[PDB]
Amino acid sequence: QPSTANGGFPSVVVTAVTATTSISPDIESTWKGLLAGESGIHALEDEFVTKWDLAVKIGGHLKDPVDSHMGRLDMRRMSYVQRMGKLLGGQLWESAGSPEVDPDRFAVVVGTGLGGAERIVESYDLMNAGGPRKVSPLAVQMIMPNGAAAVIGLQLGARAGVMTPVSACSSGSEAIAHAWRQIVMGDADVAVCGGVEGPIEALPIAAFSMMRAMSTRNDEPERASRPFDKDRDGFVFGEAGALMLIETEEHAKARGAKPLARLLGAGITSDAFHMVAPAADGVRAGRAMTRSLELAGLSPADIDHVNAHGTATPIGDAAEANAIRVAGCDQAAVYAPKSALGHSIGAVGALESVLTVLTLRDGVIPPTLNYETPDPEIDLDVVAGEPRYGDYRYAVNNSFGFGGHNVALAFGRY
Amino acid sequence: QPSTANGGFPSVVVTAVTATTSISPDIESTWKGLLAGESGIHALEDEFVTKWDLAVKIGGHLKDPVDSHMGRLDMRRMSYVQRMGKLLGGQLWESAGSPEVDPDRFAVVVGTGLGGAERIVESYDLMNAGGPRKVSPLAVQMIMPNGAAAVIGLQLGARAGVMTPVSACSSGSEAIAHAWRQIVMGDADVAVCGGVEGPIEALPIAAFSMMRAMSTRNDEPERASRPFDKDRDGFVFGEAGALMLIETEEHAKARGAKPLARLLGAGITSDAFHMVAPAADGVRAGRAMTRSLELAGLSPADIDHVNAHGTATPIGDAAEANAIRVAGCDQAAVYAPKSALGHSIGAVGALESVLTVLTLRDGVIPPTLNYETPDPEIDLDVVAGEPRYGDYRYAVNNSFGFGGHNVALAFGRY
Ligand SMILES: CCCCS(=O)(=O)Nc1ccc2cnn(C)c2c1
Ligand SMILES: CCCCS(=O)(=O)Nc1ccc2cnn(C)c2c1
Ligand SMILES: CCCCS(=O)(=O)Nc1ccc2cnn(C)c2c1
Ligand SMILES: CCCCS(=O)(=O)Nc1ccc2cnn(C)c2c1
Ligand code: NA
Ligand code: NA
Questions:
Q1: 20 to 30 A Cα–Cα from A50, which one of A15, A80, A247, B108?
Q2: The dihedral of CA A364, A349, B269, B355: what is its sign?
Q3: Are B220 and B294 within one domain?
């Protein structure tokens, strides 16, 4: 039975990371800010908040808006998530040293929650106002949810597959999972993978608010996202996109790339429980963690750190606490980055995967913000107060998305 | 190096199929109609054709509309593709004998091109008319493109993963590819997989028409879709959804299920060439065919039949002819079912995969409709005139989607 530990799978390393967040457009600055206890969450200044009198008046816009980097041409030719993908793709390749790779061994896998949806409404409006010939010949390629991955694959020249998994909050982690599979099954030697997501606007707020899924602690925005805290009251939107470069250890060594961490295994399960609520017992979500360990060749006692999904909904954090216990990982040091960065849906699993890599690289876990009165019914070792420096050898990143999609990624220190 | 032929991968069989098409809601009736030379393509009767004076006035609506099976509750709770998924999921399970399987070894993988997009506009309109609290608490789960797969996973109780690949025209084949991977990597023993897609309306017609991708032969609708014909002038929409049940041969034998065919291997590559045009040289698309043979353990001389992607665009059919030659499969008997069934985007690769299974089961290939003056620059062995009965041992189904996504599925006679 093949595993990374027993050599049945090739060794796969993470060699570059990039992200744009509510704290910073630079991932190393985001990381420094997280360690300093900074939050990206603010009072929403946009006109649409007062226009609709939204119950939610907080969130984290990108520190550096994607379109401050987009000229007239890109604003014409691409949907928002495509522009974010193009921006992150070029940043990642530069960060990797702009390597010359074999396009036929190079894959792209980028998840997203929705796609180029603003272009659906625009095309609708243009046709209503001017007839069918006022729809752009570019409408299809901007609207299609595979569009961001296709843009990145075309930009970087990836000819070993361009894939787009859609699984809501787990999309960006699932993308990394499928990129790992594409390499270990022999279809590729190198892959760009992660997730992109659109911005905060009034309709997204209304849609998730009507599930009671979002915090309404508007008077103290940086205090609103409280994963595992007794007084949590839902998640906070925090915009992001994130990509990483993974490749076989042999491929990295042959080009002089220095690994930041190892990607050891990936588990994908499903709850088949409810269309938006996670299963209370945490069993299938814990099984995704277990499966990632089976493929890595690890036991639960090896897991020093869990980067929680931790959205700060009442039911979600309780389900995840059961999942971590089910997987035998409840002695691990737990971090919930949505406490500081908010929830970026289809990007967030990729962002948190990057954070897990940086935790392993630097031997430090940032504080979970707002963890002040731990929920009495949840007993996890949540890092809080200030960063915890420790000997983290292996870690699991959790993403448990709406729809019941469970993805666990097992990483190791390089 | 593992292959199906050398036992490195478990044997995987197809045990049930279901589909709704422009010819019939019953896949066996669709098959009989194809063999009889029937077309699902008709003059569009809908009011929107005259309202917009669309250049395209032809297409194939489902013979039996999905919503003639949907009551008030389903019309309230689900997007269109979710309703189609629920309908096909229940039909497939009944067709399979309603087996009791282990939910923890049971996966669902259903592709789609777009998702619950009509619910985006509706939620937009409701909020414009009544404020944020007039958005349904069900809006998120109806809109999210993973919604159809989640509905099916919840309906049938699949807890070994629920996945949604998005790759335009290749989505439904890519779903079958990923379901095969989930089984051969050991994550599941049984999987429901395929693709669903929305209906023909005015905006979809306008969007694809403005690329010049669609036929405008309105005076003879059944003659308009002409894959590989000298006088082809683009594709024709033909609505569909399709699912198949795959499982390990051992799992099928243990429950008395009779296989219809074997699923032997799957290849996924990408062009990285253009956002909507396929690469003229056909090289990466041919490589997807080759990769499916490598994983199956077949050589090109084994391939008796290719179920072409064959959309009947000028550039697409020419690129595919090069791909088939690149893969060494140009002695295979070729069928282009879009000649009769039209193009159903995210469903069509799954539909054509079902047709490939039926070709192998019954030893017959239906006639490619409208193949009357073969394009002098394309030299393939296109089945035409009447069905060709032959000794088809192995076959490849091609799907080459907008964005440059190439999926080839290798099937064998059981
Ligand atoms: C962190 C915020 C996430 C908001 S969302 O989940 O509703 N995705 C999203 C995706 C695409 C677009 C286009 N415009 N808009 C507004 C979009 C929004
Ligand atoms: C521009 C239109 C925004 C559509 S929305 O306001 O309803 N938000 C939204 C809804 C569902 C999903 C699933 N994934 N993701 C990211 C989603 C986002
Ligand atoms: C065979 C026709 C395919 C049309 S399409 O590619 O534009 N998919 C599509 C998907 C969802 C919806 C919801 N409403 N509508 C109209 C939809 C259409
Ligand atoms: C209800 C809104 C329809 C949006 S549309 O008219 O522009 N058609 C459309 C456009 C792009 C894609 C990609 N996959 N698929 C299926 C697509 C379909
Ligand atoms: Na996490
Ligand atoms: Na085909």
A1: A80
A2: positive
A3: no
Geometric angle at alpha carbon B1, from A414 and B7, rounded to 5°: 125
Size of interface A-B (CB pairs under 8 A): 248
Give the end of a domain, one of B246, B264, B282: B264
Do residue A210 and residue B163 have CB atoms under 8 angstroms apart?
no
What are the percentages of helix, strand and coil residues in chain A, rounded to 5? 40, 20, 40
Domain of residue B374: give its range.
Answer: 265-414
Residues of A in contact with B50 (CB under 8 A): none
Asked if residues A364 and A389 have their Cβ atoms less than 8 Å apart, the reply is yes
**Which residues have a Cβ under 8 Å from the Cβ of B70 and sit 6 or more positions away?**
B78, B83, B87
Show the tokens assigned to A93: 């390749």
Q: From CA A310, how far away is CA A319, in angstroms rounded?
A: 10
A108, A162 Cβ separation under 8 angstroms: yes
Q: Out of A121, A167, A209, whose CB is closest to B164?
A: A167
Q: Are residues B325 and B372 in the same domain?
A: yes
A139/A274 same-domain check = no
DSSP code for A77: H
Spatial contact of B49 and B200, defined as CB atoms under 8 Å apart: no
Tokens linked to B167: 């790759």
The reply to whether A154 and A246 lie within a common domain is yes
Q: Answer yes or no: are the C-beta atoms of B197 and B314 closer than 8 Å.
A: no
Q: Do A210 and B139 touch (CB under 8 A)?
A: yes
φ and ψ at residue A33, rounded to 5 degrees: -70, -40
Q: What is the DSSP string of B321-336?
A: HHHHHHTT-TTSEEE-
Ion ligand 5: protein residues whose beta carbon lies under 5 Å: A 307, 352, 397-398
Q: Is the Cα torsion angle A375, A380, A383, A385 positive or negative in sign?
A: positive
What domain count does chain A have?
Answer: 2
The CA B60 to ligand 6 mean position distance, Å, reads 18
Q: Compute the distance between CA of residue A313 and CA of residue A400 in angstroms, rounded to an integer.
A: 12
Q: How far apart are CA B346 and CA A20, in angstroms?
A: 31
Task: Find the A199 Cα to ligand 1 centroid distance in Å.
Answer: 5
Residues B324 and B245 in one domain: no
Q: Within this chain, do residues A142 and A203 fall inside the same structural domain, yes or no?
A: yes
Helices (H) and strands (E) in chain B, counts: 14, 15
Cβ–Cβ contact B177 with A under 8 A: no
Q: Domain check: are A274 and A380 in the same one? A: yes
Report how far residue B57's alpha carbon sits from residue B59's, in angstroms, rounded to the nearest whole number.
Answer: 7
Give the domain-ending residue among B238, B264, B290: B264
CA distance B357 to B351: 10
**Minimal-distance CA residue to ligand 3 atom 14:** B118
Q: Determination technique for this PDB entry?
A: X-ray
Q: Do B139 and B89 have their domain in common?
A: yes
- Helices within B327-388 (DSSP H only): 338-341, 348-362
**B162-163 vs B240-248, strand pairing mode:** unpaired
**Is B140 a pocket residue for ligand 2 (Cβ < 6 Å)?**
yes
- B26 vs chain A: nearest CA distance in angstroms? 28
